[PDB]
Amino acid sequence: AAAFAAFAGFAFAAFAAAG
Amino acid sequence: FINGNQLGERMLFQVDQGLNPLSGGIYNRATASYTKFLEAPFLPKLTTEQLWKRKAPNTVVLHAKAGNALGDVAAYDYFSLGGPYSVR
Amino acid sequence: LPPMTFFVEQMSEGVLKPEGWATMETVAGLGEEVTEDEGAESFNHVYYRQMYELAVAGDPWAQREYAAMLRAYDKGCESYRASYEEADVDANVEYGVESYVVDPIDFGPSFDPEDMYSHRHAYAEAADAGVTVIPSQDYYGPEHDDPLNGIVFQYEAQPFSRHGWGGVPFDLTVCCEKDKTSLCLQGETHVSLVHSVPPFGPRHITQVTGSWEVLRPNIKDVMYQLEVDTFKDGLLGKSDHAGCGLMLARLGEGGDPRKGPTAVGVRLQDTLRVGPFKLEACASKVAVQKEEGWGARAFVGYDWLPGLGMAFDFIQERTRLRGYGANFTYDWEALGAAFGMEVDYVAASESVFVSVNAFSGNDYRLGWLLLLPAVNYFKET
Amino acid sequence: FRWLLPVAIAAEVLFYRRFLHPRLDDNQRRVEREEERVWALRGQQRRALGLHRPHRPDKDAAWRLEQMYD
């Protein structure tokens, strides 16, 4: 669950920063 | 309170009598506090009094507190001395 | 350093929303009555900033708009100055020299004289200062003195604003308790930043919060916390209120941790509408310096049964005891009374708690309804 | 010891009921006088322009109104 949470957080941060 | 500064006199009297004759016993606690906020004699009269219009007068506060206990009083209600309010 | 469960509970608060801008009422309406609606105020802010830029560029229409705004702002400022002067004159007329006094704080019932120490808390009303002062009450205080120890200051501002448009929302709160022996100093600051508005793009906001705690005699150590959160709406749909946050906690002696125990946490928040279910979810993961804790909160609603409220919580310790909790709430109106029930179920301890609150204001029918404890009460010798 | 407890009590009464009781009452009476003055001025307001009486309440209503916002 740790890897999934970290990956989801990183992806969400990258998506929010891209826009 | 005039112009944010307080002047006058204030008297406070507290009497606690234990009419216990049931382990309290006979006890009599009397506290008298007198506080006087007086205009400073050295300071000249301010414009807020004469012109009536915007200055707070300089003040000298004299406070006297006297507390006396008689009879047998338990340590719970015993008079003491100190604390932030009584003595800084 | 507090356990990772505390940090995971702090991070999994729920769906959040940072504070926006504040707007004047006189300038926005150009001297006319207005109502309240978000989206039309940040639009006014960004629009007036852009029109100022264009007027500087040389567009005549932007110049005309900015001139009209300046005229309205000047008229409003002069009106407020006149109102302040009139209010001061009226206050002088009512009480010639006597400044207004304030009501003392009511502590409650006690065997000491209830009217005693009231004179100490009765002070003259302060001027229109920006700061706000609140007293702090300790649990146990001196027997023969007032139980109010310490103070807390609260301040809010929107600096870097021109003519009431734009700026950076900023909040500050400092609790100070200083005596001859101890010292407690707790500070917190919040800063808001806006990147775009619905007319000029999406809603992009970033909030930065920083809180530090100092307890000098007991702990002799200070604690720092810094969190940055980013919020954007409509990331995967029309509206999803997506948010992502990162927090850093340090327990160093001063400034940098200097080998002090550090902790890093990250949280994600989103709400989604699927079929008849409007689900709000917030999940966070925290890692201290090396256990890692996970937390998740969800709020679920069913439109066919709006009276029922369902909340789910899941907390996982470091690998791995998983605690699951379900809370249901319901309300109804009885005969001349209102009853509200709450059921909490925990699977870790296999426990169910049911609470029913009742309020009746017409008569004492509910009192006659319940009389079992009177018979149940026995002297037993 | 305890034998001196009652006598001092008299002194306390000698300080309060001979001195405290009149003094404060005086101020109370003083306040009452001022109150009357206000109503007199109100009468003048009703005297001018031919206005009718302001139907002031009785003291029984007044002391109850002390508990009110008044």
Ligand SMILES: CCCCCCCCCCCC
């Ligand atoms: C100035 C460019 C706009 C985007 C800035 C994003 C900064 C926050 C991203 C890192 C924190 C998650």
